[PDB]
Amino acid sequence: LDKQKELDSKVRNVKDKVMCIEHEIKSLEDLQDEYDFKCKTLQNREHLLLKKMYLMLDNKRKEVVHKIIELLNVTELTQNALINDELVEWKRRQQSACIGGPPNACLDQLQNWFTIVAESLQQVRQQLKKLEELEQKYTYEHDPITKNKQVLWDRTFSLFQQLIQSSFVVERQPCMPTHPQRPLVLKTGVQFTVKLRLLVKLQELNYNLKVKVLFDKDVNERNTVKGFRKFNILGTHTKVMNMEESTNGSLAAEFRHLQLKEQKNAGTRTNEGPLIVTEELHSLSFETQLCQPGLVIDLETTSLPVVVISNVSQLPSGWASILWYNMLVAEPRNLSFFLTPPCARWAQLSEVLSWQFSSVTKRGLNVDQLNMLGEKLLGPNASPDGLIPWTRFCKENINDKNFPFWLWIESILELIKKHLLPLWNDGCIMGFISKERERALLKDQQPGTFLLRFSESSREGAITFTWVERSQNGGEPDFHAVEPYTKKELSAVTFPDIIRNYKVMAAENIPENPLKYLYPNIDKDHAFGKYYSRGYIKTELISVS
Amino acid sequence: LDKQKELDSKVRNVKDKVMCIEHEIKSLEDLQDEYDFKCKTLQNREHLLLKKMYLMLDNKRKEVVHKIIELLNVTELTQNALINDELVEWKRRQQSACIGGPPNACLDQLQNWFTIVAESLQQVRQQLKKLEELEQKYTYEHDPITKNKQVLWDRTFSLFQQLIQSSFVVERQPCMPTHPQRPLVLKTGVQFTVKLRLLVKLQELNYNLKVKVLFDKDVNERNTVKGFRKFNILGTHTKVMNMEESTNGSLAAEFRHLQLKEQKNAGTRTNEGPLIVTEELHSLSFETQLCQPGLVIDLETTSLPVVVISNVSQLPSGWASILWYNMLVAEPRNLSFFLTPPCARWAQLSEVLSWQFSSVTKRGLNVDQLNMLGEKLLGPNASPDGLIPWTRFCKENINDKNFPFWLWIESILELIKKHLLPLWNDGCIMGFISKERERALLKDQQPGTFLLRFSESSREGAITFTWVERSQNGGEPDFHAVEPYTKKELSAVTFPDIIRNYKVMAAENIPENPLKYLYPNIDKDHAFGKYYSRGYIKTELISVS
DNA sequence: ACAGTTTCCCGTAAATGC
DNA sequence: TGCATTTACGGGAAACTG
């Protein structure tokens, strides 16, 4: 918080200097109409006077001018810290937030700094108008209020222009309301929501800024990239900024209804075959203009690159791109990123992987799970420093299968989120376990040998448990694992409930298993007591050998 | 076929008379330029002739005229049989086809009659032009070709206008391609297909008739009915008629892409509460115009009343209305039908009910099934003549439940169509059985007492089987029936497969049941042998006590 | 105080682009 | 001769608008 606290004083300092300067100006204005009055009289009261006038006013004019020049300097130092370090830093954190990292801090802190310096410059402008008013009443050969006159004005337009343009930001990145945890992937036909905001807060600026949403503004990939598709925003291209919309006393503009549709044409005929899969990056630019007498400024800002899809089936793949993008970019951004997808270091990907789980559920991945996935992407010499090609991530088919690494994880996620949350969250699934170590850990010979592992084979995402009773011949019995369960069998029956009754060909008339010790001895039932689903002949579905 | 065959000769008769008449006309034309020539000469060959000329030509003119007047009469008799009995009958059969009755006969037979008479009138018109050409060359006080002159022309416009307007028909009623067996229920947003056709076939009429589709043309229910909603067609409002579209050498026009959307407004604000549920009837009118020199005719025809819905969930209810409509209407049709839904006789509804099944499957309802449903709609004095209010059909909740009769049957259908077709079709389900007679028929004491009955309780549509083994105390045991299976349990497991393994708490190590005689002794397996679904530990889902 | 109705969506069965 | 994208909607439930 140190740096913040220090920027806090630089801003208070600016405000002080501006007020301090306005005082000296009233004192300059009055003190002049005093000397001017005393002059007129002495002239008609005829038909140290001389020294006072022409000498102190000058010292006072010069005095003020110098002080304004000094305020503008400090304003610069302050502004630059505001714009280039604080805003720029807030933005980096936003990127990371979108892909499941720490939550963005509220923009109020930022807004305060901005408007406070925004008001000071507006003030210097007035003080500048006042000074000119004095020269019209009185001037002279080396009148400072005339030389520094022009320089100071212009210099106050810059600081102010810069500051206001930088204050226009995309508070909440584009996103589909049905996908709160997958923000930069917009699907055609559906209407996304974006939130803009001017960190400046200027009363006389409410209901004046008209915002217009544009698509792919200044995007060379349009021409340069082959097959590249074009889209049109559709819903409400424009929306005026208020302070009413957001309960938070702040100037903003939230779009809903915004919607993309293809510009199906011959101009940019499809190529299906062009430079890149439909995971090319686009941008949403927001443009507005502060129009005032003697002032005119155009504000513009754009969202982070977006991915446009036509079917939610293309979302898991689209997400992959945005993880990869934001995981490896910051810098003004490259919409041709995937023409040359830089590799990713594993200490970094492993983390983001865990974020993914901690974003759709209540618990991420721990170290065992991560090493299992790691020797799966980098093999035995898996290492935090190891590099992982984009290709090995979302394109190559993985360990011995018919799907890439990413869609496999994406589908387990989808599998957790719709059928295992409670079990998952309360750590009863160790899903990612090398099949070796599965075996290894199971001479726990507390024959109720339970271990829920996610399937490595399915396109789809399934769960299996592994069995260990005795071999009847000195040999732990053969390490038993049922065919995985996909959404199907699970949607017709909870997973716990199928665990309770896995009876599997059991000669009896009361109790039958292999059930009864969850990991090392958490008692089958005590383990899964919460999760169970506890005139006709009531029945139940059950998995059986 | 008798009546048809007779109308066939009336048409050949018309064609004969027209050709016969054209011969007599060339003979009139030449025979005149002969007599006229002989006149001119005898005049300059000076400066029984007389009798021949002025007397036979007259007998010939009168002769022809009379014969035309006689052709037009017969044309009328023929036309009227064509238009009023044959077309009108073809249309009645179409109605019945839409709701699952016998299949419509091909319109070729009809088309032949129409064009043949259509060509004859076009001919009489020419012959009429020729006759006028003769009067210009020669006329006289009681020249028949002048008195009957005008009458005959006009009379040939009528027969021809009538005939052509009647020939314009809606060959294939409106319908959604995803619902081939439910034609008059159109859902907003989706694009239906209708097929028009001109039964006239006139070469010089190809690519001339422009058809325009209109919605609710001349529909007073718009004003008269409260809450009544308005829609706009959307896709391609127009489509020119060809002979190319249909392989069948015939003039037609098929619309695809036609699409309805609400005219959401304040003009006809919603009432949700108005005179009728959203099962109000609309119409699709088709308008075109035969434009020719000296001829102009406007052709118009409309589809049978339509039902517009916004969600396929509103389809089973919409269908109910169209069954009821077409089951009880013929007549120019009443779009306010449901303001006073006439009751339905059961000998008639029972049938249509069966059609429904024989339309989504391969076997309808037999008499036992129909009496079961009958004592359910009319009770113990159920009778073919019994009347059944619309209300008891699609509104009242039925025997002791929370849904109307119709949606219950509609849901069993939906249940058959997605999960029991083979069993259903090969008569292994007796679905509709009074619970009494179920019991009654089961002291068949061939303890493999199977009986698949459709559930009378579900909102949804489910199937149960009934059990009969022995009571161990002289008393047939309590007549056992498992809770019904809805789509859920069935989508995760076929129904046969659950029958094979209903094991139900069975102390053992090889075989266990209650399975094994399907109805009277068709051997469980021999019964359901076709239907069964016949390194991990392969499993199966199974229903259990 | 919802209760019929429509809108929005998702993921599938199929169509379709080059 | 194909798949890589896109369109169609049946279907479960939120959002309408009164």
CB B145 within 8 A of CB B121: no
- B491 and chain A in contact, CB less than 8 A: yes
Q: Is the dihedral of CA A318, A321, A326, A329 positive or negative?
A: negative
Residue of A539, A540, A543, A545 to mutate, interface with B, max B Cβ within 10 Å: A539
CB B504 within 8 A of CB B475: no
Q: How far is the CA of B174 from the C1' of D16 (A)?
A: 29
Helix (H) or strand (E) holding A296: strand A295-302
Beta strands B463-465; B452-454: pairing state: antiparallel
Any residues with CB less than 8 A from the CB of B275 and at least 6 apart, and which? B225, B226, B227, B228, B339
Residue of A466, A478, A541 to mutate, interface with B, max B Cβ within 10 Å: A541
Among all protein residues, pick the one whose CA is nearest to the C1' atom of D17.
Answer: B270
Q: To the nearest whole angstrom, how far is the Cα of A426 from the nearest Cα of chain B? A: 27
Asked whether strand D has any atom less than 7 Å from the CB of A187, the reply is no
Nearest CB to A537; choose among B481, B507, B542: B481
Chain A residues 257-276 with Cβ under 7 Å of strand C are 264, 269-273
Distance CA A444, CA A519 (A): 9
Asked whether strand C has any atom less than 7 Å from the CB of A234, the reply is no
Question: What's the longest Cα–Cα distance across chain B?
Answer: 136
- B435 and chain A in contact, CB less than 8 A: no
Distance CA B1, CA A539 (A): 59
Q: How far is CA B415 from CA A539, B65, B355, B489, in A?
A: 20, 69, 16, 12
- B483 and chain A in contact, CB less than 8 A: yes
Chain B residue numbers with beta carbons less than 8 Å from the beta carbon of A537 are 467, 480-483, 545
Give the CA angle between residues A303, A305, A306 to the nearest 5°.
95
Chain B's closest residue to A543, CA to CA, is B541
Helix (H) or strand (E) holding A254: strand A251-259
CB A305 within 8 A of CB A281: yes
Strand locations in A29-92 (E): none
Asked whether strand D has any atom less than 7 Å from the CB of B270, the reply is yes
Distance CA B265, CA B230 (A): 9
Distance CA B63, CA B65 (A): 6
- Identify residue A425 by its one-letter amino acid code: N
- From B286, B292, B201, B297, select the one nearest B242 (Cα to Cα): B201
- A464 and chain B in contact, CB less than 8 A: yes
Distance CA B125, CA B143 (A): 19
Chain A residues 243-272 with Cβ under 7 Å of strand D are 262, 264, 272
Looking at beta carbons, which pairs linking A123-130 to residues 24 or more positions away fall under 8 Å?
A123/A18, A123/A22, A124/A18, A124/A21, A124/A68, A124/A71, A124/A72, A124/A152, A124/A156, A125/A153, A125/A156, A125/A160, A127/A18, A127/A21, A127/A22, A127/A25, A127/A68, A128/A68, A128/A152, A128/A153, A128/A156, A130/A25, A130/A29
Helix (H) or strand (E) holding B394: helix B390-394
- The answer to whether B482 contacts A545, with C-beta atoms less than 8 Å apart, is no
Q: Is the dihedral of CA B494, B500, B501, B505 positive or negative?
A: positive
Beta strands A210-215; A284-292: pairing state: antiparallel
Q: To the nearest whole angstrom, how far is the Cα of B535 from the nearest Cα of chain A? A: 8
Q: How far is CA A436 from CA A377, A399, A479, B304, in A?
A: 17, 15, 11, 70
- From A509, A520, A373, select the one nearest A449 (Cα to Cα): A520
> Collapsing DSSP states into helix, strand and coil, what is residue B14?
helix
Closest nucleotide to B262: CA versus each C1': C6
Nearest CB to B483; choose among A489, A492, A537: A537
Question: What resolution does the deposited structure have, in angstroms?
Answer: 2.9
Q: What share of chain A is helix, strand, coil (3-state, %, to 5)?
A: 45, 15, 40
Q: How far is CA A365 from CA A67, A416, A432, A455, in A?
A: 58, 13, 9, 16
Chain B residue numbers with beta carbons less than 8 Å from the beta carbon of A541 are 489, 492-493, 541-544
Q: How far is CA B457 from CA A78, A535, B117, B378, B545, in A?
A: 75, 11, 59, 19, 20
CB A240 within 8 A of CB A212: no
- From B373, B400, B398, B397, select the one nearest B386 (Cα to Cα): B373
CB B119 within 8 A of CB B17: no
- From A279, A318, A362, select the one nearest A179 (Cα to Cα): A318
- Identify residue B78 by its one-letter amino acid code: T
Asked whether strand D has any atom less than 7 Å from the CB of A376, the reply is no
* Dihedral pair phi/psi, residue A333, rounded to 5°: -95, 135
Any residues with CB less than 8 A from the CB of A469 and at least 6 apart, and which? A447, A449, A477, A514
- The answer to whether B482 contacts A537, with C-beta atoms less than 8 Å apart, is yes
Chain B residue numbers with beta carbons less than 8 Å from the beta carbon of A536 are 464, 481-484
- Identify residue B417 by its one-letter amino acid code: K
Helix (H) or strand (E) holding B488: helix B487-491
- The answer to whether A540 contacts B536, with C-beta atoms less than 8 Å apart, is no
Asked whether strand D has any atom less than 7 Å from the CB of B179, the reply is yes
Any residues with CB less than 8 A from the CB of A264 and at least 6 apart, and which? none
- B481 and chain A in contact, CB less than 8 A: yes
Nearest CB to A540; choose among B509, B539, B544: B544
Method used to obtain the model = X-ray
Q: Which of chain C's bases lie under 7 Å from a protein CB?
A: 3-13, 17-18
Quote the tokens at residue A203: 């009363």
> Collapsing DSSP states into helix, strand and coil, what is residue B202?
coil
Distance CA A524, CA A534 (A): 16
CB B287 within 8 A of CB B212: yes
- The answer to whether A482 contacts B542, with C-beta atoms less than 8 Å apart, is no
CB B308 within 8 A of CB B188: yes
Nearest CB to B489; choose among A537, A538, A541: A541
Per-position DSSP letters for B107-129, written without gaps between them: THHHHHHHHHHHHHHHHHHHHHH
Q: Give the N- to C-terminal CA distance of chain A in Å, as an integer.
A: 61
CB B526 within 8 A of CB A521: no
Per-position DSSP letters for A98-146, written without gaps between them: HTTSSPPPPTHHHHHHHHHHHHHHHHHHHHHHHHHHHHHH---TT-HHH
Chain B residue numbers with beta carbons less than 8 Å from the beta carbon of A492 are 488-489, 491-493, 541
Q: Which residue has the tokens 């097929």?
A: B195
Q: How far is CA A421 from CA A372, A427, A430, A494, B59, in A?
A: 21, 10, 13, 11, 103
CB A471 within 8 A of CB A519: no
Strand locations in B157-230 (E): 168-172, 185-187, 191-198, 210-215
Distance CA B315, CA B307 (A): 9
Distance CA A173, CA A98 (A): 8
Q: How far is the CA of A101 from the C1' of C8 (A)?
A: 30
- From A180, A240, A187, select the one nearest A211 (Cα to Cα): A240
Put residue B379 in one of left, alpha, beta given phi > 0 → left and psi -120 to 50 → alpha: left
Q: Which residue has the tokens 């002989």?
A: B38
Q: Which domains, ranges and CATH numbers included, belong to chain B?
A: 1-168 (1.20.1050.20), 169-311 (2.60.40.630), 312-432 (1.10.238.10), 433-545 (3.30.505.10)
Residue of B419, B455, B537, B540 to mutate, interface with A, max A Cβ within 10 Å: B537
- A511 and chain B in contact, CB less than 8 A: no
